[PDB]
Amino acid sequence: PDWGYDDKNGPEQWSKLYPIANGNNQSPVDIKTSETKHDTSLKPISVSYNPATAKEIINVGHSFHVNFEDNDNRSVLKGGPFSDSYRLFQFHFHWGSTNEHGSEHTVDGVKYSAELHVAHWNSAKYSSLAEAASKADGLAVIGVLMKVGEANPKLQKVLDALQAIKTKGKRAPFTNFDPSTLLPSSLDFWTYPGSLTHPPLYESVTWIICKESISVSSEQLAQFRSLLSNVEGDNAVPMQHNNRPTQPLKGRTVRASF
Ligand SMILES: Nc1cc(C(Cl)=C(Cl)Cl)c(S(N)(=O)=O)cc1S(N)(=O)=O
Ligand SMILES: [Zn+2]
Numbered sequence: 001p002d003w004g005y006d007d008k009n010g011p012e013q014w015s016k017l018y019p020i021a022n023g024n025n026q027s028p029v030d031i032k033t034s035e036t037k038h039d040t041s042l043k044p045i046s047v048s049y050n051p052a053t054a055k056e057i058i059n060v061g062h063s064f065h066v067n068f069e070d071n072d073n074r075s076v077l078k079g080g081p082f083s084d085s086y087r088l089f090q091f092h093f094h095w096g097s098t099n100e101h102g103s104e105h106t107v108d109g110v111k112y113s114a115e116l117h118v119a120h121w122n123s124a125k126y127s128s129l130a131e132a133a134s135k136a137d138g139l140a141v142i143g144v145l146m147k148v149g150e151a152n153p154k155l156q157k158v159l160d161a162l163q164a165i166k167t168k169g170k171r172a173p174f175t176n177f178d179p180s181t182l183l184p185s186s187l188d189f190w191t192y193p194g195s196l197t198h199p200p201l202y203e204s205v206t207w208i209i210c211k212e213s214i215s216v217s218s219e220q221l222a223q224f225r226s227l228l229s230n231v232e233g234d235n236a237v238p239m240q241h242n243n244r245p246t247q248p249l250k251g252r253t254v255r256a257s258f
Contacts, residue, residue, distance in 0.1 A: 002017055003017065003198070003199045004062055005062060005242050005243075014201065018199050018200060018201050020200075020201045020202070020203065023195070023201070023203055024250040024251075025193055025194050025195055025203035025250075025252065026194065026203070026247035026248070026250075027104070027194035027195045027196070027197050027205060027247060028103075028104035028105040028106075028194070028197055028207075028244060028246050028247065029105065029192065029194065029246050029247055029248075030105075030106045030107075030109060030246045031106070031190050031209065031254050032108060032254075033108055035254070036255065037253050037254070037255050037256065038255070038256045038257075039081075039255040039256065042080055042189075042191065042255065042256075042257040043079040043080060044079050044080070044187060044257070045077070045079050045187040045189060045208060045257075046077070046078040046079040047076075047077050047118075047180045047183065047187075048075070048076055049075040049088055049178045049180050050074035050075050050178070051175075051176045051178040052176065053068040053069045053070075053074050053075040054066070054068055054069075054174055054176060054177040054179075055067045055068055055069050055174065055175070056171055056173060056174055057158075057161050057162075057164075057165055057171065057174040058169075058170075058171040059166070059168055059169060059171070059227060059228075061168040061169075062198070062229065062242050063092050063093070063094070063239070063242050064092065064093075064162065064165060064227060065090055065091075066090065066091050066158065066174055066177075066179070067089065068088050068090065070087050070089040070123075070129065073085060073123065075087065076088065077142070080189060080208055080257065081191050082140060082206070083124075084122050084123075084125060084137070085123060086120035086121060086122055086139075086140040087120055087121055087122075088118070088119075088120050089119055089121055089129055090117075090118075090119045091116060091118045091179045091182070092116075092117050092119075093114055093115065093116055093117070093146075094114060094115045094117070094197070094242050094243045095113070095114040095115075095221055095224045095225065095241060095242065095243065096111075096113065096241045096243050097225075097240045097241045099113045099218060099221065101113075101243065102114045102115070102146075102221065102243055103115040103145050103146065103243065104197050104243050104246075105145065105207075105209050105246070106246055107145070112145040112147050112148075112213060113147060113148040114146035114221060114224070115143055115144065115145055115146060115243070116142075116143070116144040116146060117143055117197075118142040118144075118179055118182075118183070119139060119141045120139065121133070121138060121139055122135070122140070125137060125138075132204070133202060133204055134202050134204055136203065136204060137204075137206070138204040139196075139204045139205045139206070140206045140208065141205050141207055141208065142183070142189075142208045143207060143208065143209045143210065144183060144184060144210045144214055145209075145213045145214075146216040147213040147214070147215060147216070148215075148217070148218060149215045149216070149217070150215045150217065151216075151217040151220060152215045152216050154182050155182070155216065155220055157174075157177055158177075159220060161174055162224075162227060165227075166227065166228050167231055167232040168228070168229060168230060168231045170232070183214075184210050184212035184213065184214050185212065186210070186211060186212045188210070188212065188257055189208045189209055189210055189211060189256075189257045189258075190207075190209040190211070190254050190255065191206060191209070191254070191257070192207050192252050192253065192254045192255065193206060193252060194206075194207050197244045198242075211258060225238055225239060225240055226239075
């Protein structure tokens with residue numbers, strides 16, 4: 001695994017292997033609210049997820065992923081800036097080494113403690129995730145800023161599952177879960193054209209960033225950081241952080257739905 005988040009293989013070094021790191025549509029960004037453009041043409045975000053599409057949780061070494069069956073349109077995102085239906089395939093989190101930072105997106109310079117990514121691919125235009133992932137209109141990702149405070153009970157199934165995937169490569173079934181339960185009450189959002197926030201950093205993402213945060217406790221964040229990046233039997237290496245710094249807007253417009 002050439003890339004990671006440590007001093008030698010981390011975000012400031014990704015450009016050596018992935019020159020798109022220094023591109024014009026890189027994510028995440030700082031959303032400066034004085035510079036957002038309210039767009040009257042934005043429709044409300046519509047999510048409709050079937051809990052039976054939940055499939056598997058996986059320790060991928062730098063993070064963990066919760067994957068969904070994506071063979072049909074049982075679980076879809078519509079509305080907002082999109083004409084096309086986008087098919088749910090994954091959610092995951094980013095976090096930092098301490099409570100002070102850990103989100104990827106920031107709002108008016110303010111860093112949150114963690115961030116939820118709910119990822120979808122354009123099944124109107126493309127035939128698979130692998131095809132869509134490199135296309136400018138291929139991916140739609142909802143970002144939710146997670147503010148340290150009260151324990152969030154909606155995270156329970158996810159946190160309880162981590163003990164079965166402690167080390168790199170471990171995976172387990174993760175079923176009967178609707179991740180719309182993790183979204184805030186308001187789906188008021190910012191949107192901008194951007195990228196995956198880690199390699200391969202493709203500029204394929206329409207970002208949908210929620211205005212409203214969701215909560216997370218200090219102890220729930222500790223559960224994320226207690227996951228191990230090493231394989232079973234090796235020296236324990238906690239997953240301390242996996243958030244990328246904010247990237248230059250390079251003249252992009254962040255639009256507001258509100
Ligand atoms: N950084 C990143 C990478 C991927 C991956 Cl691992 C692929 Cl192999 Cl496409 C994906 S995804 N949704 O897994 O295709 C999303 C992101 S993110 N953090 O939401 O921008
Ligand atoms: Zn992410």
